[model samples]
Target: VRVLATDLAFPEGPVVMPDGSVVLVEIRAQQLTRVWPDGRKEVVAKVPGGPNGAALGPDGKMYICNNGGFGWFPSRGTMMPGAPAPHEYIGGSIQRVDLQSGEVETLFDKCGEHPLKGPNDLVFDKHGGLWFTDLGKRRARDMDVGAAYYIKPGMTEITEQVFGTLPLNGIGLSPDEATMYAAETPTGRLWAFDLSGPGEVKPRDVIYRGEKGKPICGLGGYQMFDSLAVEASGNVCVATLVSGCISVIAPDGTLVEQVPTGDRVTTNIAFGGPDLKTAYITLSGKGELIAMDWSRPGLPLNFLNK
Candidate 1:
């Protein structure tokens, strides 16, 4: 693995720019940072809360999933986020950040009665709409149920598509945009939901039906899932926690491969470079960003690549 940058404060949500630089969030430091090809780092914006994921919007601005904030602790010679004390938790939000001016704006923090708890990861579809996951906060003794939300293009309203499930972290869409994939953390399960329309989920077939969506694949051990990216071959490359690897799961529920990252908190991955085969990964536990050439090219994201 090629180490690109180090000393970030729990970095996640890597957004690869066309200029060969990478933009990612430093959750603990509460800022958006950009890493150049020469390993130099620059602060893009001072985001107050914990920004978990970032995606390029149709208007050429950046959209962020702000998980409010998290209490931090130093462990294993690295920093890790803990369940925040009541006063420290600021509530989650969906924010818009301008790439040039570095301005941060809150687009939506609440959808009707339900307030966003821990907005994790997000991906934009070809139609300019977005799909994101709310991982929910974990308190001392209890936690909130995770859900997936969808926001139509050019709309202020956000709607929940999947709810009452395990805490979901990573989110992505298939190459054809007909399927939405989400990774459930703790349970280590990956779900696939059929998209009938932009934000519509089709009912599952009774014969192969599961609770929310189809259970594509799951790990048996203690390897928890984080964020993910889709490959050109339609494989889901999900960053794993305890196992410290990226588990490549096929759409047909097959375990394709496991690529190790050497960090317990391998938080996120993004595809960039000319051919889109360079995988930029965030090793959050060690506060490092690394890169490697993938065997297959990654699926081009809607606004970011397409």
Candidate 2:
């Protein structure tokens, strides 16, 4: 991998813009940052709490997962790890930011009755809905359960599509937009769900019984899963922690290949550039952003170009 920027504060959720800039969130830094083509870093917004996953919406607005906050230690020239912010824990939320006006507004703090613990990754659909995964919150004694939710762009509605699913990290839609993929953090399993309509899946039992969505692939050793991106060829590339690589899983539940990054806490990946073959990956623990040439173009996002 070619290093682009160094000394970031635990970066994740890369959003590659058409203007040759990559916008990402640093969880430890608790802010949204933008990296130029020449590797210069700029602060885009002072997003309080742990700003995790981010995406551009159709309305030219910025959508992000604000996990309230995280218990973070200083990244003192070392690969710092994370735990539940026991002392500083407040709550979790989904936020919308006006990119030009620099204004932030809360959408929904809870799906319905359950408060969002740790809203992690998000992706916009062809429709007006935003699909996201809530990885839940952790405390010193107990941890919260996670689920998936669908919210409208106008902040008018928010509903839970699946409850008690795995503690999901990265989420993305298939190139065809018919399947939803979610990567579980602790289990390191990549799952696929068949979509029926906006915010709706075919088999509701997939959340509880865990039988509908097939476990396409998983790592063998002590690794974890992070955010993900879909390839134009329909492969799901998941950021793998501990193992420090991107695990490319095929559509038919098979391991296509593994692209190594060689950093312990490689947290995320996104595709940009003219052909979409240029991959921007975030090595969170090492506090670096790197890029590499990919074998294929990435699936176009809903509002990335428009």
Candidate 3:
């Protein structure tokens, strides 16, 4: 693995820019940071709560999933999330930030009565709408059921697409843009739904069918899912925690391969470079970002270099 940057405060959601830079969230530090090709680091914005997933919107700015902060601790030199919520907990939010100015703005924080518990991962579909997962918050006595949502680009309203399910961590759309995929963290399962329309899914999806994801992929051990990236070949490369690696799920129902990152908290992955095969990975626990050449090229992101 080629180490790109180190000592970030629990980096997640690496976004590879066209200029060979990567922007990611430092959740524990509550900030957005940019790391250049030569490994120079700069804080782009000081965000409140815990900034989690990040993606570029059609407006040429960064959209963030702020998870409302977490109760965390340092364990053996690595940052780890603990039980209960943070003392400053205030529910998750979707935020927009100017790429050059570092101006952060809250777009939506809730939908009606139910507040977004822990906005986790997000992806933009082909229709210019955003699909994201609220992983939910974990407390001592109660935990919120994770949900997936949809919002039109630059819209202040959000629509619930799926809800009351497992803690869905990473979210992505299929190569053909007809299927939406999310990975359940604790269950170690990946699921798919037929997209009837932008952000609308068919009923009785793979998520509601059973406890274990139907033929998506499964593994022994505590390898939970975090964030994921889709390869142009239609393979799902999911970052795994508890066990460090990327699990590649075939478009159908098969486990193609498990690529090892060798860190317990490999939280995210993104593809960039002119060839779209440079895989950028975040080792969150270790506070490091690394890269490698993928066997297959990654899918072109929705709003990049267009």
Candidate 4:
């Protein structure tokens, strides 16, 4: 276990670059930062809106899901400490950044007739399309609608397929690129959709429905889901914000294992190392990065090592 950086506002969506540095989003700070293996850190870009999940696209640029921004509140002490709530920007959407030049641009803000509430995490498919999730928003009394969308690589159009109406967060594709998995925050469930082609998703089916267990920790509430990564064997390992464990689910919906990180907020995990069998998990609650040996090698995504 190592403390990479501390006192960060809110860190999510980590992407390990080719040069052995990790890039992640500081949601509250609204910036993209890079942390080297030796603990050196630097701000890559100052993106004012809350940027959540990030990935390197086939075009060698970084695709970002700007959850827009959230209103914040400053409290002295709270169970799950956070910068604040109630972001300034209401509508959240997706954006892209030029990895080489640090240029940022918005891709899709609305899907034809609907406004995006909060675009969370995103994953690119082998075919060059991108899939993302919207976490929705909470007013003084009501919760807005949340959903998953598929956007073409060129950002010319978007297809909003499934709506959660609650909170739908983290999303990823299977090893074979035949299925898509998304984590539902409030519901504590992992949902799957069969992919027929680019920008097309079948109705979702429950993959792993979390039951009675120790809840994970978060700011807004307890037990919300975050990002996910897939193993080479087709197992989906998801970070349980409140559950504090990594829920590994097989392709056939088998709950293989629930490895507890002994931390209150294990936000996300990424497989690295030479053979890709080492899992680096983010213990965000205590602001720690933990490395664990995996039982199986993780599958490389389409453009990851190419």
Candidate 5:
């Protein structure tokens, strides 16, 4: 893949638009940007909190999971892990943006007594409800109270399904929509769940623990496992943070291949292009988008391009 653009502020959650443009979240910059094929960049909207992942919903609007903000430190290095910046407003929540009018709306914040910490990546199921991962916060040590949630459209009923006690990030469903997969950040593990329905995801056996390969690393225990994409053959492609590789895992919990992304912070991946076989990955550490020819076709996206 060629260099289409550069100097992005920690881009994540790429959503290929209908017009052949790519919109992604600049988490550190606190803005959503649209990058043209000619390398032209435009700010679509200014989100106050740290926006991580974005998806076009069934309603033809952009859905965003904001992490509020993360406090920054120059000595701590760029792209600090865990929680939003202390100055970030509306830190943890699922929000919607009207593409036409650029209007922003909050869909969900907290479920009962649990407040959303860091809303990371999300995917819409076949039934129109949204599933998202909350990476939670990092206190004295990087804690994992991360959770997966299901939210019905146009309602405040948010069901918090506790998947793990660590940093739960990327999320997707199988081609048949019978299984759900989530990636853990600190542990570099991919978790599986048996889908009972749109809003119910029961834990299956442990899918892939992080110990199979060399671990990715960062300061303060900031490890790998971020966003993920599922292929038509039920293979899961997960992005690793410090390791800078896309770990492809078979459905039966086997490590298939680890493709080097050539960048330290390869945050997320999405299937797009003419046939949806091109995997466009976000190389956020270097602020670039890397496109590769995928070996298998991606499962049909349920919400957009339907």
Candidate 6:
């Protein structure tokens, strides 16, 4: 395990750039940052709200899943996202950022009649359409319901796909784009949704949560879930929280492996490197990004990888 950069302000959503640098969001600092291979750090942009996850769009711009802003406080020598009061919380949004100019534009704040609560993460399909999750926001006494949403290639309107689930954090597609996977943060469960076509979810066995999705795997203890990435072999690498490990689960709901990162707030991971064998993980609580060698290559993303 190699420490790439340290002293980050609760980093998440690591995006591996083609130039061998990793761009990620510092939620507490409200900035998108880049970490070089040599441990150099630079500010990519100042994203006012909490920029949770990011992806490269077809336009060669950065698409951000802004979870609105979160109230933060110190805990265990690191900052944690706090549940804000209803009045102080800003709403969630999908934003497009121009890397060169650092210009941010709001794309969608509401899907149909429902307003987006906390936009967490996003992934783009081969068709250039976008799939995202609304983890929703939490307050002192109440919390918002989580859901999944989609946006067509060249449309202004957003579509809600899965509704009223737990806080969905990480999201990814299978290598063939036939299955959609979402990681529920609070339940520490991984779910799979069947895709008939673009943004078309075929109803499957629903869990007790009443969500129209099937649970592929779940953890039994106090561990929570976060963002995820797919291996070339179709395994879902979910960042397991509290337990501080990456839970690699097979599509058949088997517990494949758990790679420990030694930090309880392990938040996200991205696969990159010449052959995509290097796994870069965000040790959120430690404010560090670490790299390690992976046994398998990662599934090439739609537009991010070739």
Q: Estimate the TM-score of every prediction.
A: 0.97, 0.94, 0.95, 0.86, 0.88, 0.97
Error of 2 at 126 (Å): 0.9
Candidate 5 contains a number of clashing pairs equal to 8
Query: Can you tell me which runs of candidate 3 are displaced by over 4 Å?
Result: 84-86, 154-156, 205-215
Candidate 4 RMSD computed on C-alpha atoms after optimal superposition onto the true structure = 4.9
**Taking the tens digit of each residue's C-alpha lDDT, what string does model 6 give over 44-74?**
8999888999998888888999988898889
The clash count of every prediction, one per candidate, is 0, 0, 1, 14, 8, 0
Write the residue-wise lDDT of candidate 2 on 1-306 in tens digits: 688999898899899998768989988788888899888988888888878899998888789998877776555455464556566655788888887767887787887787788999999988868999988877777776667888865667998876676688899999778999989899899988888877786774644466557677877889889999999899999999888899999999788888999786888999998888899999887788999999889888889953
- Local distance difference test, per candidate? 0.91, 0.84, 0.86, 0.73, 0.77, 0.90
User: Considering TM-score, which of the candidate structures 2 and 4 is the better prediction for this target?
Assistant: 2
Model 5, range 183-206, lDDT digits (tens) per residue?
877778787777677668655444
Scored by lDDT, model 2 comes in at 0.84
Query: Which ranges in model 4 have alpha carbons more than 4 Å from their true place?
Result: 73-87, 204-223
By lDDT, who's the top model here? 1
Cα deviation of 295, candidate 2, in Å: 0.8
For candidate 3, write residues 172-200 as lDDT tens digits.
98888889898888878887877777778
User: Residue 216 of model 5: what lDDT?
Assistant: 25
Clashing pairs in 5: 67-91, 68-91, 69-84, 69-85, 70-84, 70-85, 71-85, 144-165
The global Cα lDDT (0 to 1) of model 6 is: 0.90
lDDT (tens digit, per residue) of candidate 1 on 1-306: 799999999989999987779999999999999999888999999999789999999999889999999989888888788898988788899999998999999999987798999999999988889899999998999998889999988756799898888899999988888999999999889999998988878868743434758888989978899999999899999999999999999989799999999999999999999799999999999999999889999999988888
How many clashing residue pairs, candidate 4? 14
**lDDT score for residue 208 of model 2:** 44
